[PDB]
Amino acid sequence: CNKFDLKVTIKPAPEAKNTMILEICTRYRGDQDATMSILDISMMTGFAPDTDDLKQLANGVDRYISKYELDKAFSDRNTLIIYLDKVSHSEDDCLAFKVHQYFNVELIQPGAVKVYAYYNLEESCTRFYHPEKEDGKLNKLCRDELCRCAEENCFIKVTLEERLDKACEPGVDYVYKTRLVKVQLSNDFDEYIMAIEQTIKSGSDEVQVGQQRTFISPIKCREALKLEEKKHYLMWGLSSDFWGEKPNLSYIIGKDTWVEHWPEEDECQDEENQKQCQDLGAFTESMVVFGCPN
Amino acid sequence: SPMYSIITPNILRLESEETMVLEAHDAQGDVPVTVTVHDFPGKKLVLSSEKTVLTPATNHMGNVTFTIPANREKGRNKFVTVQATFGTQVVEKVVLVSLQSGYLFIQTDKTIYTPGSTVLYRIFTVNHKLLPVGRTVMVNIENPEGIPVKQDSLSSQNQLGVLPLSWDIPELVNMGQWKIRAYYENSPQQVFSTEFEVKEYVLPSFEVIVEPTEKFYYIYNEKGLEVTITARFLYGKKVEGTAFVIFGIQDGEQRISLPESLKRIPIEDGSGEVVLSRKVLLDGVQNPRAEDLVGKSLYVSATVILHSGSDMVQAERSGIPIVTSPYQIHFTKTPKYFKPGMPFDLMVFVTNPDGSPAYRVPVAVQGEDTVQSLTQGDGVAKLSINTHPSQKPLSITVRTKKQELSEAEQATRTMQALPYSTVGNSNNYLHLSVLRTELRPGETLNVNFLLRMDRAHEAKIRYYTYLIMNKGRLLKAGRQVREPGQDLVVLPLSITTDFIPSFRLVAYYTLIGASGQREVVADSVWVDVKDSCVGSLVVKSGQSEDRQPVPGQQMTLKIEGDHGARVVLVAVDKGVFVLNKKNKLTQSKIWDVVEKADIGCTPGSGKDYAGVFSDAGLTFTSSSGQQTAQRAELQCPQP
Amino acid sequence: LDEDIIAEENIVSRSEFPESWLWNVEDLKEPPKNGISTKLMNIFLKDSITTWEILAVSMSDKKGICVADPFEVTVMQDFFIDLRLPYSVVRNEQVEIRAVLYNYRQNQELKVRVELLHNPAFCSLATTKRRHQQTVTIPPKSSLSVPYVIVPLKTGLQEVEVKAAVYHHFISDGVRKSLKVVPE
Amino acid sequence: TSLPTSNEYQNEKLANELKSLLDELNVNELATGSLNTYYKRTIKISGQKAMYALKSKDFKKMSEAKYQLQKIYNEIDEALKSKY
């Protein structure tokens, strides 16, 4: 960025139940106010600008939108440029227009704004926006320099049978009963240092009983799993959940992974936990002595 | 008294055939002649092999064909002494020679490459006749700070004059204007260069074109400069979008933008209108005597954006002239010497400001109101004035005469033509009046041979000896016979493709008269023929009729050209040319290389008998000692 | 998979977009007629939707060199996609590529299901299992822009691919362009 | 029974003409393998047109398609001849 500033506020309006307000704020980092400049906006799948608003703007001075773009039916307007006669070097020049979702969808991609002066395009800045995603930023998982995609689902009527099934698929490669030592967290990616209490089915990871293994998850999954320390756990996943090289290996908290809170010795004495502690127990023997039916 | 004359090109060339004209004037029976070239000074006998006889059959006119080798021989011109011996008599002359082998042209597949994209290139190699020859060539690839980053050495022997080549552009490297240079291993000094830009780019999906309604701006034009902006995809289709336009003034290489002239217009249905107003243009400098702005130029940069925001394109029309008159006037295609009494054919050249030939424009001279003549499609106007037999310099001044232009808006120019300075001031002249249009090979041109002298020695003159220069070599040398009492004789000149792009004609006669004085009267004329390939080449469509082809589809290509010729193909996404259209190969670019290499430096004639000869690329040495000013300068007279 | 539309199973994209080609050499050895040898050439056009400019030079020792005029050939389509990738992205920065959908049909709007194919080497709303499509409407004689936001995940040479099909017609395009990924 | 109506006859001719091709489609699709990508890219879209067209029992779609597929079949032959 640096040549331009860009603050894109995507807020809901007061007073449908979906419609909101997009606000765009730009300033030029220089001595004079920039000359003619471009705002290259795009709508979030499902939205498109309120027209009555867009006109308002174009009537404005310092600003203009081409007839060509006005005439189209709001529905047909999923990108759109707003030309500017200037952008102040001094303070932020801002504006906004109500957008409306007319279309019902799951997984709504983020819109984005872009700015620059007509003369030079490589000196642009480019801010995303989105209702849930914090910064209009997709969900990734990056340690140091290596990133991998995490826009999938968190992990996801349980019978010893439903487990002797899902737990023999191709992906499954590690099946563990592990106790959780350290519960760390960060603004980006929280981790977990769980030590392995019994290697139920060994994987491409040469890990002896007792050793500690480091799992990770996106900061957006705090709700999916109630985290407790010294709480024992049953879990399995794939060997594609492996992070970086050996033997400093890690585990990735994904969709293809399964998570269930393994009760405690004297907690299973309860008369509602029994339906579990038993299924579990059996599962243990059924995976150690026999293995997978296939 | 017999007289032998030797006529050669002003400047010879290595490893190529040259020709020189042997003549026996007023002699009897067969005359055997031996011709020899020696290095200068001294003796190396570089070429003696050739012998010939001037039979009374062929009116004593000789053919010289020879090829000077390139033996182990600077900054100082090397010469040679030619020696022609008729019977026992021995005439000779000391001419200039050049190491200049011929030409070189380079072709690159694109005009512009990205780091890591290979550049294909061909070196076409030819002699001064533009015929494919085979020598050894060196080829450098300079980076944009001039430093050779690669060279090879290649021979064009048995390659029909075409050297394929490539170079893999490294991944990291300076962007900027790279250059490919090549010279004949014989002559390093005559280097040849073509450029190519290395940049980072994606191709654009349309082209943008800026255009002033006029090819110039008139300072008193209240409307300012009007400009129409035009955008259309590469697949031919009209563009919608908005476009930012802005102007400036150029002085020399110096460039001032008029920040205030910035305008944002809509590009609708592939087009848009926009204007610089006289006010901005003047304010934009400092607001002074508009006259001041005369001579400078304007420019416009436009930048279109599709309404989709996907793709941008810049483009700029540069150096639009600020002028007080629309037309310019040039005498550089008109000779600078006339014959008093004889009609003088004026070749006025009328260019638009930019430089382009202006069609159908009227012109006439100072004196006479009735004389007018337009400008044929070549920006040329043929006007002829009958001159007075006065030994006074003849100053002519021409002036445009277009209706709808004010007499201040019209453009003029003046030249000065001197009379032909005869021998002993005898008043003997020769004029070649040639009908002047667009000559084309096949068409037949008439050369009026007009004799100007006292009937006293009129019966004496029996024949005209004529010659043809072309690409700076002899293309033909013949005789035109005459009978006493005749002042006009007409020469049927067949015009073949071997005449392109322009040929010179020098006719001369010789006689004894007045008081036992050996004389030479002559005349030289330039005639620019219609420029175009010497053979032909065309690439039209295969399927006589059809709808547009489709991505990946088979299409038949048709190539109509000379039998046995070699064609070398390349097809280029025209999107490239929207990033860079410079440095392409053109045939017009080649004709331009060939003319600037002319050894003849004048449109027509000579100050004296001996000038006509040195003005066209020629020397005349006779037994009687009437030789031409030796030539020892490689280039023409520094302008 | 039985609708009034073409299937991604059956869309074969365009991918071969040279900037120059046909750097070939042909010889007019044919039987001269009226002095003019004629060769017929069988060439296969490349996938790009643009105008090709073919330039020929001829060299003959009898008649010399000859820059043939340029000769234009326009490859086009009534509907197609323009995948406008920039020169280079930086691994792990989020951008937004645009798929521009052109409809040059005379007089009728087009309904397309356009789709950014999944690439493990990129972080897109497109997964091994779930695809990423919208269903959109282009007026006639114009362009619809289609945002796809992504995140490049591995350096070196990566590949974005879009497919679209029009309903009720059986027209389809698909482009496969590649862009430079560079580390920070 | 007797004879079919106008529509009835034409409609059933087209269809069988059409089918007649779809039959030996697969053979074709398979010859594209050797051929330049345009052939494959083409035939696949032409194939579907047919099969939907055929099942749609509508004259237009059916003939229109009848022809699409005819062409490309011919552009295959022409192709494989310049190769032995």
Side-chain angles (χ1 to χ4, degrees), chain A residues 40-42 68 72 76 78-79 107-110 112 128 133 136-140 145-153 255, chain C residues 91-92 94-96 98 122-125 128-130 132 134 137-139 142-151 153 184:
Chain A
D40 189 357
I41 306 160
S42 59
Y68 177 97
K72 15 182 61 184
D76 224 295
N78 75 326
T79 94
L107 283 207
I108 97 147
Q109 159 177 319
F128 305 77
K133 273 97 183 190
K137 239 62 168 278
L138 290 209
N139 295 351
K140 38 179 163 30
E145 287 178 7
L146 192 63
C147 262
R148 91 180 283 282
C149 210
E151 256 295 357
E152 44 197 344
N153 309 347
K255 54 163 189 169
Chain C
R91 171 179 38 108
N92 311 316
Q94 187 177 283
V95 298
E96 172 182 62
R98 305 268 258 258
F122 279 101
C123 187
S124 45
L125 299 167
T128 59
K129 310 205 173 173
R130 178 210 327 134
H132 185 38
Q134 303 87 314
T137 272
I138 323 162
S142 56
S143 26
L144 190 43
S145 225
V146 179
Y148 280 119
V149 341
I150 55 172
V151 173
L153 293 190
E184 3 36 30

Coordinates of all heavy atoms in Angstrom, one line a residue, chain A residues 40-42 68 72 76 78-79 107-110 112 128 133 136-140 145-153 255, chain C residues 91-92 94-96 98 122-125 128-130 132 134 137-139 142-151 153 184:
Chain A
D40 N -12.2 0.7 -7.5 CA -12.7 -0.5 -8.1 C -13.2 -1.6 -7.1 O -12.5 -2.4 -6.6 CB -11.5 -1.1 -9.0 CG -12.0 -2.3 -9.9 OD1 -13.2 -2.6 -9.8 OD2 -11.2 -2.8 -10.7
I41 N -14.6 -1.5 -7.0 CA -15.3 -2.3 -6.0 C -15.9 -3.6 -6.5 O -16.1 -3.7 -7.7 CB -16.4 -1.4 -5.4 CG1 -15.9 -0.1 -5.0 CG2 -17.2 -2.1 -4.4 CD1 -16.9 1.0 -4.9
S42 N -16.1 -4.6 -5.6 CA -16.9 -5.7 -6.0 C -17.8 -6.2 -4.9 O -17.5 -6.1 -3.7 CB -16.0 -6.9 -6.5 OG -15.1 -7.3 -5.5
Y68 N -23.4 4.5 -18.1 CA -23.3 3.0 -18.4 C -23.5 2.1 -17.2 O -24.2 1.1 -17.3 CB -22.0 2.6 -19.1 CG -21.9 1.1 -19.3 CD1 -22.2 0.6 -20.5 CD2 -21.5 0.3 -18.3 CE1 -22.2 -0.8 -20.7 CE2 -21.5 -1.1 -18.5 CZ -21.8 -1.6 -19.7 OH -21.7 -3.0 -19.9
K72 N -27.8 0.0 -15.7 CA -28.0 -1.4 -15.4 C -28.9 -1.6 -14.1 O -29.0 -0.8 -13.3 CB -26.7 -2.2 -15.2 CG -25.5 -1.3 -15.1 CD -24.2 -2.2 -15.0 CE -23.9 -3.0 -16.2 NZ -22.7 -3.9 -16.1
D76 N -27.6 -6.5 -11.7 CA -26.7 -6.9 -12.8 C -25.3 -6.2 -12.5 O -24.4 -6.2 -13.3 CB -27.2 -6.5 -14.2 CG -27.0 -7.6 -15.2 OD1 -25.8 -8.0 -15.5 OD2 -28.0 -8.2 -15.7
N78 N -22.5 -6.5 -10.1 CA -21.6 -7.1 -9.1 C -20.2 -6.6 -9.0 O -19.5 -6.9 -8.1 CB -21.7 -8.6 -9.2 CG -20.8 -9.1 -10.4 OD1 -20.7 -8.4 -11.4 ND2 -20.2 -10.2 -10.2
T79 N -19.8 -5.8 -10.0 CA -18.6 -5.0 -9.8 C -19.0 -3.6 -10.3 O -20.1 -3.5 -10.9 CB -17.3 -5.4 -10.7 OG1 -17.3 -4.7 -11.9 CG2 -17.3 -6.9 -10.9
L107 N -21.8 -19.9 2.1 CA -20.5 -19.6 1.7 C -20.4 -18.4 0.8 O -20.1 -18.5 -0.4 CB -19.8 -20.8 1.0 CG -19.4 -21.9 2.0 CD1 -18.3 -22.7 1.4 CD2 -18.9 -21.3 3.3
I108 N -20.6 -17.2 1.4 CA -20.6 -16.0 0.6 C -19.2 -15.3 0.5 O -18.7 -14.8 1.5 CB -21.6 -15.0 1.1 CG1 -21.0 -13.9 2.0 CG2 -22.7 -15.7 1.8 CD1 -21.6 -12.6 1.9
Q109 N -18.5 -15.5 -0.6 CA -17.2 -14.9 -0.8 C -17.1 -13.4 -0.5 O -18.2 -12.7 -0.6 CB -16.7 -15.1 -2.3 CG -15.6 -14.2 -2.8 CD -15.2 -14.6 -4.2 OE1 -15.1 -15.7 -4.5 NE2 -15.0 -13.5 -5.0
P110 N -16.0 -12.9 -0.1 CA -15.8 -11.5 0.3 C -15.6 -10.6 -0.9 O -15.0 -10.9 -1.9 CB -14.4 -11.6 1.0 CG -14.2 -13.0 1.4 CD -14.9 -13.8 0.3
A112 N -14.3 -6.8 -2.3 CA -13.1 -6.0 -2.2 C -13.1 -4.7 -2.9 O -13.8 -4.5 -3.9 CB -11.9 -6.8 -2.6
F128 N -10.1 -6.0 1.4 CA -11.3 -6.8 1.4 C -12.3 -6.5 2.5 O -12.0 -5.8 3.5 CB -10.9 -8.3 1.5 CG -9.9 -8.7 0.4 CD1 -8.6 -8.4 0.5 CD2 -10.4 -9.5 -0.6 CE1 -7.7 -8.9 -0.4 CE2 -9.4 -9.9 -1.6 CZ -8.1 -9.6 -1.5
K133 N -15.9 -13.1 8.4 CA -14.5 -13.1 8.3 C -14.0 -11.7 8.8 O -14.5 -10.7 8.3 CB -14.0 -13.4 6.9 CG -13.8 -14.9 6.6 CD -14.9 -15.5 5.9 CE -14.7 -17.0 5.7 NZ -15.7 -17.6 4.8
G136 N -12.1 -9.7 5.8 CA -12.4 -10.1 4.5 C -11.3 -11.1 4.1 O -11.2 -11.4 2.9
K137 N -10.6 -11.6 5.1 CA -9.5 -12.4 4.9 C -9.9 -13.9 5.0 O -10.6 -14.3 5.9 CB -8.5 -12.2 6.0 CG -7.1 -11.8 5.5 CD -7.2 -10.5 4.8 CE -5.8 -9.9 4.5 NZ -5.3 -9.1 5.7
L138 N -9.6 -14.7 4.0 CA -9.9 -16.1 4.0 C -9.2 -16.8 5.2 O -8.3 -16.2 5.8 CB -9.5 -16.8 2.7 CG -10.3 -16.4 1.5 CD1 -10.4 -17.5 0.5 CD2 -11.7 -16.0 2.1
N139 N -9.6 -18.0 5.5 CA -9.0 -18.7 6.6 C -7.8 -19.6 6.2 O -8.0 -20.7 5.7 CB -10.1 -19.5 7.3 CG -11.2 -18.7 7.9 OD1 -11.0 -17.5 8.0 ND2 -12.3 -19.3 8.4
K140 N -6.7 -19.1 6.6 CA -5.4 -19.9 6.4 C -4.7 -20.2 7.7 O -4.9 -19.7 8.8 CB -4.5 -19.2 5.4 CG -4.5 -17.7 5.5 CD -3.5 -17.1 4.5 CE -3.7 -15.6 4.3 NZ -4.3 -15.1 5.6
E145 N 6.8 -19.7 7.3 CA 6.7 -19.3 5.9 C 5.7 -20.2 5.1 O 5.3 -19.9 4.0 CB 8.0 -19.3 5.1 CG 9.0 -18.2 5.5 CD 10.3 -18.4 4.8 OE1 10.5 -19.3 4.0 OE2 11.2 -17.6 5.1
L146 N 5.3 -21.3 5.7 CA 4.5 -22.3 5.0 C 3.0 -22.1 5.4 O 2.7 -22.1 6.6 CB 5.0 -23.7 5.4 CG 4.4 -24.8 4.5 CD1 4.8 -24.7 3.1 CD2 4.9 -26.2 5.1
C147 N 2.2 -22.0 4.4 CA 0.7 -21.8 4.6 C 0.0 -23.0 4.0 O 0.4 -23.5 3.0 CB 0.2 -20.5 4.1 SG 0.0 -19.2 5.3
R148 N -1.2 -23.3 4.6 CA -2.1 -24.3 4.0 C -3.5 -23.9 4.3 O -3.8 -23.2 5.2 CB -1.7 -25.7 4.5 CG -2.5 -26.1 5.7 CD -2.2 -27.5 6.2 NE -2.8 -28.6 5.4 CZ -4.1 -29.0 5.5 NH1 -4.9 -28.4 6.4 NH2 -4.6 -29.9 4.7
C149 N -4.4 -24.3 3.4 CA -5.8 -23.8 3.4 C -6.6 -24.3 4.5 O -6.6 -25.5 4.8 CB -6.4 -24.0 2.0 SG -7.6 -22.8 1.5
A150 N -7.4 -23.4 5.1 CA -8.3 -23.7 6.2 C -9.6 -23.0 6.1 O -10.0 -22.3 7.0 CB -7.6 -23.4 7.5
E151 N -10.2 -23.1 4.9 CA -11.5 -22.6 4.7 C -12.6 -23.7 4.7 O -13.7 -23.5 4.3 CB -11.6 -21.8 3.4 CG -11.7 -20.2 3.6 CD -12.9 -19.8 4.3 OE1 -13.8 -20.6 4.6 OE2 -13.0 -18.5 4.5
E152 N -12.1 -24.8 5.2 CA -13.0 -26.0 5.3 C -13.8 -25.9 6.6 O -13.9 -24.8 7.2 CB -12.2 -27.3 5.3 CG -10.9 -27.2 6.1 CD -9.9 -28.3 5.8 OE1 -10.3 -29.3 5.1 OE2 -8.8 -28.2 6.2
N153 N -14.5 -27.0 6.9 CA -15.3 -27.0 8.1 C -14.4 -27.5 9.3 O -13.4 -28.1 9.1 CB -16.4 -28.0 7.9 CG -17.2 -27.7 6.7 OD1 -17.1 -26.7 6.0 ND2 -18.1 -28.7 6.3
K255 N -11.3 -31.0 9.1 CA -12.7 -31.6 8.9 C -12.5 -33.1 9.0 O -13.2 -33.8 9.8 CB -13.2 -31.2 7.5 CG -12.3 -31.5 6.4 CD -13.1 -31.5 5.0 CE -12.2 -32.0 3.9 NZ -13.0 -32.2 2.7
Chain C
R91 N 3.2 -15.5 -2.8 CA 2.7 -16.6 -2.0 C 2.1 -16.0 -0.7 O 2.8 -15.3 0.0 CB 3.8 -17.6 -1.7 CG 3.4 -18.7 -0.7 CD 4.5 -19.8 -0.5 NE 5.8 -19.2 -0.5 CZ 6.6 -19.0 0.6 NH1 6.2 -19.4 1.7 NH2 7.8 -18.4 0.4
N92 N 0.9 -16.4 -0.4 CA 0.3 -16.1 0.9 C -0.3 -14.7 1.1 O -0.7 -14.3 2.2 CB 1.2 -16.4 2.1 CG 1.9 -17.7 2.0 OD1 1.2 -18.7 1.7 ND2 3.2 -17.8 2.2
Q94 N -3.5 -12.3 -0.3 CA -4.8 -12.5 -0.8 C -5.1 -11.4 -1.9 O -5.0 -10.3 -1.6 CB -5.9 -12.5 0.3 CG -7.4 -12.8 -0.2 CD -8.4 -12.8 1.0 OE1 -8.4 -13.8 1.7 NE2 -9.2 -11.8 1.1
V95 N -5.5 -11.9 -3.0 CA -5.9 -11.0 -4.1 C -7.3 -11.4 -4.7 O -8.0 -12.2 -4.1 CB -4.9 -11.1 -5.2 CG1 -3.6 -10.7 -4.7 CG2 -4.9 -12.6 -5.7
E96 N -7.6 -10.8 -5.8 CA -8.9 -11.1 -6.5 C -8.7 -11.1 -7.9 O -8.6 -10.1 -8.6 CB -9.9 -10.0 -6.1 CG -11.2 -10.1 -6.9 CD -12.1 -8.9 -6.5 OE1 -11.7 -7.8 -6.8 OE2 -13.2 -9.2 -6.0
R98 N -10.2 -11.6 -11.7 CA -11.4 -11.4 -12.4 C -11.5 -12.3 -13.6 O -10.6 -12.3 -14.5 CB -11.6 -10.0 -12.7 CG -11.6 -9.1 -11.5 CD -12.9 -8.8 -10.9 NE -13.4 -7.5 -11.3 CZ -13.4 -6.5 -10.5 NH1 -12.9 -6.5 -9.3 NH2 -14.0 -5.3 -10.9
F122 N -3.8 -23.3 -4.0 CA -4.4 -22.0 -3.9 C -5.5 -22.1 -2.8 O -6.1 -23.2 -2.6 CB -5.2 -21.6 -5.2 CG -4.3 -21.1 -6.2 CD1 -3.9 -21.8 -7.3 CD2 -3.9 -19.7 -6.2 CE1 -3.1 -21.3 -8.3 CE2 -3.1 -19.2 -7.2 CZ -2.7 -20.0 -8.2
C123 N -5.8 -21.0 -2.1 CA -6.8 -21.1 -1.1 C -8.0 -20.3 -1.6 O -8.1 -19.1 -1.5 CB -6.3 -20.5 0.2 SG -7.5 -20.7 1.5
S124 N -9.0 -21.1 -2.1 CA -10.2 -20.6 -2.7 C -11.4 -21.2 -2.1 O -11.3 -22.3 -1.5 CB -10.2 -20.9 -4.2 OG -9.8 -22.3 -4.4
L125 N -12.6 -20.6 -2.2 CA -13.8 -21.2 -1.7 C -14.1 -22.6 -2.3 O -15.2 -23.1 -2.1 CB -15.0 -20.3 -2.0 CG -14.9 -18.9 -1.4 CD1 -16.0 -18.0 -2.0 CD2 -15.2 -19.1 0.1
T128 N -11.9 -29.9 -2.5 CA -11.8 -31.2 -3.2 C -13.2 -31.7 -3.5 O -13.5 -32.4 -4.5 CB -11.1 -32.2 -2.3 OG1 -11.8 -32.3 -1.1 CG2 -9.7 -31.8 -2.1
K129 N -14.2 -31.3 -2.6 CA -15.5 -31.9 -2.6 C -16.6 -30.9 -3.1 O -17.3 -31.1 -4.1 CB -15.9 -32.4 -1.3 CG -14.8 -33.4 -0.7 CD -15.4 -34.4 0.3 CE -14.4 -35.4 0.7 NZ -14.9 -36.3 1.8
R130 N -16.6 -29.7 -2.4 CA -17.5 -28.6 -2.8 C -16.9 -27.8 -3.9 O -15.7 -27.4 -3.9 CB -17.7 -27.7 -1.5 CG -18.5 -26.5 -1.7 CD -18.1 -25.3 -0.8 NE -17.6 -25.8 0.5 CZ -16.5 -25.4 1.2 NH1 -15.7 -24.4 0.6 NH2 -16.2 -25.9 2.3
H132 N -17.0 -24.2 -6.5 CA -17.4 -22.8 -6.4 C -18.0 -22.2 -7.6 O -17.4 -21.7 -8.5 CB -16.2 -22.0 -5.9 CG -16.5 -20.6 -5.6 ND1 -17.7 -20.2 -5.0 CD2 -15.8 -19.4 -5.7 CE1 -17.7 -18.9 -4.8 NE2 -16.6 -18.4 -5.3
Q134 N -21.3 -19.6 -9.2 CA -22.4 -18.7 -9.1 C -23.2 -19.0 -10.4 O -22.8 -19.8 -11.2 CB -22.0 -17.2 -9.2 CG -21.0 -16.7 -8.2 CD -19.6 -17.0 -8.6 OE1 -19.2 -18.1 -9.1 NE2 -18.7 -16.0 -8.4
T137 N -26.2 -13.8 -15.1 CA -26.8 -13.3 -16.3 C -26.0 -12.1 -16.9 O -25.8 -11.1 -16.3 CB -28.2 -12.8 -15.9 OG1 -29.1 -13.9 -16.0 CG2 -28.7 -11.7 -16.8
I138 N -25.7 -12.3 -18.2 CA -25.0 -11.3 -19.0 C -26.0 -10.7 -20.0 O -26.6 -11.4 -20.7 CB -23.9 -11.9 -19.8 CG1 -23.2 -13.0 -19.0 CG2 -22.9 -10.9 -20.3 CD1 -22.4 -14.0 -19.9
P139 N -26.1 -9.4 -20.0 CA -26.9 -8.8 -21.1 C -26.3 -9.1 -22.4 O -25.2 -9.7 -22.4 CB -26.8 -7.3 -20.8 CG -26.5 -7.2 -19.3 CD -25.7 -8.4 -19.0
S142 N -22.4 -7.4 -24.3 CA -21.6 -6.9 -23.2 C -20.9 -7.9 -22.3 O -21.0 -9.1 -22.5 CB -22.3 -5.8 -22.4 OG -23.5 -6.4 -21.9
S143 N -20.4 -7.4 -21.2 CA -19.5 -8.2 -20.4 C -20.0 -8.3 -19.0 O -20.4 -7.3 -18.4 CB -18.1 -7.5 -20.4 OG -18.2 -6.1 -20.7
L144 N -19.9 -9.5 -18.4 CA -20.0 -9.6 -16.9 C -18.7 -9.9 -16.3 O -18.0 -10.9 -16.7 CB -21.1 -10.7 -16.6 CG -21.4 -10.6 -15.1 CD1 -21.6 -9.2 -14.6 CD2 -22.7 -11.5 -14.8
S145 N -18.4 -9.2 -15.2 CA -17.2 -9.5 -14.5 C -17.4 -10.4 -13.3 O -18.5 -10.3 -12.6 CB -16.6 -8.2 -14.0 OG -15.2 -8.1 -14.2
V146 N -16.6 -11.4 -13.1 CA -16.8 -12.4 -12.0 C -15.6 -12.5 -11.1 O -14.6 -13.1 -11.5 CB -17.2 -13.7 -12.6 CG1 -17.4 -14.7 -11.5 CG2 -18.4 -13.6 -13.4
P147 N -15.7 -11.9 -9.9 CA -14.7 -11.9 -8.9 C -14.5 -13.3 -8.4 O -15.4 -14.1 -8.2 CB -15.2 -11.1 -7.8 CG -16.1 -10.1 -8.4 CD -16.8 -10.9 -9.6
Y148 N -13.2 -13.7 -8.3 CA -12.8 -14.9 -7.5 C -11.6 -14.4 -6.7 O -10.6 -13.9 -7.3 CB -12.4 -16.0 -8.5 CG -13.5 -16.8 -9.1 CD1 -13.7 -16.9 -10.4 CD2 -14.4 -17.5 -8.3 CE1 -14.7 -17.6 -11.0 CE2 -15.4 -18.2 -8.8 CZ -15.6 -18.3 -10.2 OH -16.7 -19.0 -10.7
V149 N -11.8 -14.5 -5.4 CA -10.7 -14.1 -4.5 C -9.9 -15.4 -4.1 O -10.6 -16.4 -3.8 CB -11.1 -13.4 -3.2 CG1 -12.5 -12.8 -3.4 CG2 -11.1 -14.3 -2.1
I150 N -8.6 -15.3 -4.1 CA -7.8 -16.5 -3.8 C -6.6 -16.1 -3.0 O -6.3 -14.9 -2.7 CB -7.4 -17.2 -5.1 CG1 -6.7 -16.3 -6.1 CG2 -8.6 -17.9 -5.8 CD1 -6.1 -17.0 -7.3
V151 N -5.8 -17.1 -2.7 CA -4.5 -16.9 -2.0 C -3.6 -18.0 -2.5 O -3.8 -19.2 -2.4 CB -4.7 -17.1 -0.5 CG1 -3.4 -17.1 0.2 CG2 -5.6 -16.0 0.1
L153 N -0.5 -20.4 -2.7 CA 0.0 -21.2 -1.5 C 1.4 -21.8 -1.8 O 2.0 -22.1 -0.8 CB -1.0 -22.3 -1.1 CG -2.3 -21.8 -0.5 CD1 -3.1 -23.0 0.1 CD2 -2.2 -20.7 0.5
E184 N 7.9 -14.1 -0.4 CA 8.2 -12.8 0.2 C 9.6 -12.8 0.9 O 10.4 -12.0 0.6 CB 7.1 -12.4 1.2 CG 6.0 -13.5 1.4 CD 6.6 -14.9 1.3 OE1 7.8 -15.1 1.7 OE2 5.8 -15.8 0.9

